[PDB]
Every structure is written in structure tokens, then in C-alpha cells.
Amino acid sequence: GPLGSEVVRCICEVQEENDFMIQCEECQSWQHGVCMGLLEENVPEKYTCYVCQ
Ligand SMILES: [Zn+2]
Ligand SMILES: [Zn+2]
């Protein structure tokens, strides 16, 4: 994001993407779905990350 904020900002603090990334509706950064306790089939349309929820 602006001011060079990290696009991948997950609780695991790993920047590398995997096969299932999800974008927070509030802060607009991305997390690994598995870190957020989610699966492809249960991530909601209005997903909010660990920081923002
Ligand atoms: Zn993660
Ligand atoms: Zn967020």
C-alpha cells in the first residue's frame, strides 16, 4: 500500500505467497488463508483480517 506498506501482511510474518491468499476488506493487505483459519470454501465475501476484525 502507500508509504511502502507491505502488501502481504500476515500474522506469520512471512512475505512469500502460497496457493491461497485473501485480501482484507478493511486494510486491503493480503494474508494466507490458512493462517486466518480459513479454506477456499469458507472465506466470506466480506473477509476481515486478524488485525482489523
Ligand atoms: Zn501467514
Ligand atoms: Zn485488515
From Swiss-Prot:
Localization of this protein: Nucleus
Post-translation changes: Ubiquitinated by TRIM26; leading to proteasomal degradation.
Tissues/organs with expression: Expressed in heart, kidney, liver, lung, pancreas, placenta, spleen and testis. Not expressed in brain, skeletal muscle, colon, ovary, prostate, small intestine and thymus. Expressed in colon and ovary cancer cell lines while it is not expressed in the respective normal tissues.
Transmembrane intervals: none
Top-level taxonomic group: Eukaryota
Zn finger intervals (PHD-type): 9-53
Quaternary assembly: Homodimer; disulfide-linked. Component of some MLL1/MLL complex, at least composed of the core components KMT2A/MLL1, ASH2L, HCFC1, WDR5 and RBBP5, as well as the facultative components BACC1, CHD8, E2F6, HSP70, INO80C, KANSL1, LAS1L, MAX, MCRS1, MGA, KAT8/MOF, PELP1, PHF20, PRP31, RING2, RUVB1/TIP49A, RUVB2/TIP49B, SENP3, TAF1, TAF4, TAF6, TAF7, TAF9 and TEX10. Component of the NSL complex at least composed of MOF/KAT8, KANSL1, KANSL2, KANSL3, MCRS1, PHF20, OGT1/OGT, WDR5 and HCFC1.
Domain writeup: The Tudor domain 2 mediates reading of dimethyl-lysine residues.
Misc remark: Antibodies against PHF20 are present in sera from patients with hepatocellular carcinoma, glioblastoma and childhood medulloblastula.
Role summary: Methyllysine-binding protein, component of the MOF histone acetyltransferase protein complex. Not required for maintaining the global histone H4 'Lys-16' acetylation (H4K16ac) levels or locus specific histone acetylation, but instead works downstream in transcriptional regulation of MOF target genes. As part of the NSL complex it may be involved in acetylation of nucleosomal histone H4 on several lysine residues. Contributes to methyllysine-dependent p53/TP53 stabilization and up-regulation after DNA damage.
Protein name, per record: PHD finger protein 20
Species name: Homo sapiens (Human)
Gene from which the chain derives: PHF20
